[model samples]
Structure formats: C-alpha cells, structure tokens
Target: GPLGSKKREVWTDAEHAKFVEGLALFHKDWKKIKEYIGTKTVVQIRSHAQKYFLKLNKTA
Candidate 1:
C-alpha cells in the first residue's frame, strides 16, 4: 500500500501562545530557546505569528 501523508497539525491558541512566549522570552535568537522547547523547525515557529509578531513583519 502507498503510504499516506500525515496532515499538518493545526496549533491551538495556547500552543501558539507558548511558542510566541518562547520567542519573546528568548528574544531574536530562538535557537537557544528551541533547544529547551524541543525540535520544531524554525520555519514553523516563524510562520505561526508572521502576521502579528511585529519582528516577523515580512512574509515569503
């Protein structure tokens, strides 16, 4: 059987808040904080609040 692709998980507000809080508390350098938060790709974090993070003002 062909393997089915997993659906992208839609983050809840609480989940989004956690990441945003981590981003803010960690400041501009999220790599260090991410180490504590486990292995989410940087792009995933960036896209979460791209519309309103202030710092992440631009979209691709």
Candidate 2:
C-alpha cells in the first residue's frame, strides 16, 4: 500500500450515497459537494465519481 498521503475514507455505501446526492445538488462543483460530505476531499470525491460513472456507463 502506498502510504505516502493521508489515509482516504472508506468507500462505504453511505459515503457513495452522499456523493451521488452531492452531485445532483451541486453538479460538478466538488468544493460545494464537500459541504455535504465533509469527510471526503474534493479530489477524492471527484475521482470516485469518475470511476463510479464509468462503471455505470459500461453497464448501460
């Protein structure tokens, strides 16, 4: 495990739910999305969102 950076939050179902909710409300504004999920960094949220949607894209 590359432990160079601060530990990241676990990607729990609850955390993922908050991320989707944040996106619907704030769109691409990671800074604003963070107000709803303060535990996640903006970079963390955005990268996960990208991966999540990419997976969804393959399924659809």
Candidate 3:
C-alpha cells in the first residue's frame, strides 16, 4: 500500500456480459469501452481481457 489507496473490485457476471458487448461494439478498443460498459474503468476493462483472453497485439 505504498502508493496505493483503493483495491480493484471483482467483476460481476452482469458487467462481464456487458464487457462482451463492449468488445463487440468497440472492436477491442478499451479507451472508450468503459463508457459503454456502464461500470469498471479502462484499466479494469483491459485487466479483464488480460485475465481471460490471451494478449494478442498492442491492444488485445
């Protein structure tokens, strides 16, 4: 907790569903996917992909 404050919360199944949608609508662009995701931040969204899907390119 040196330079940190809050910890990242778990992703609910509800939001995960919408994340799939975000992926479809945004074509893997997470910069603005958070707005469409209804919850979670850009880092959160990217983190999800990193956890689930294999990192493909500079963005995957």
- Strongest candidate by lDDT: 2
Q: lDDT tens digits, residues 2-52, model 1? A: 145443345556555667666567776656544434544566665664644
lDDT of 2 by residue, 1-60 (tens): 323455456567776777888777887777887657654567767778787677664444
Question: lDDT ranking from best to worst?
Answer: 2, 3, 1
- The 10 consecutive residues of candidate 3 with the worst lDDT sum are 1-10
Angstrom error of the Cα, residue 27, model 3: value is: 0.8
TM-score of each: 0.46, 0.60, 0.58
Which model scores highest in TM-score? 2
Which TM-score value belongs to model 2? 0.60
Q: Model 3, residue 48: what's the lDDT?
A: 85
lDDT of 3: 0.66
Q: Where is the poorest 10-residue window by lDDT in model 2?
A: 1-10
Selected candidate, larger TM-score, 1 vs 3 = 3
Q: Candidate 3 lDDT, tens digit per residue, 7-54?
A: 344677776666777677778788867766544478767878666566
The reply for model 3, stretches above 4 Å from the true place, is: 1-10, 52-60
Off by over 4 Å in 1: 1-10, 54-60
lDDT against the true structure, each candidate: 0.55, 0.69, 0.66
Model 2: lDDT of residue 6:
56
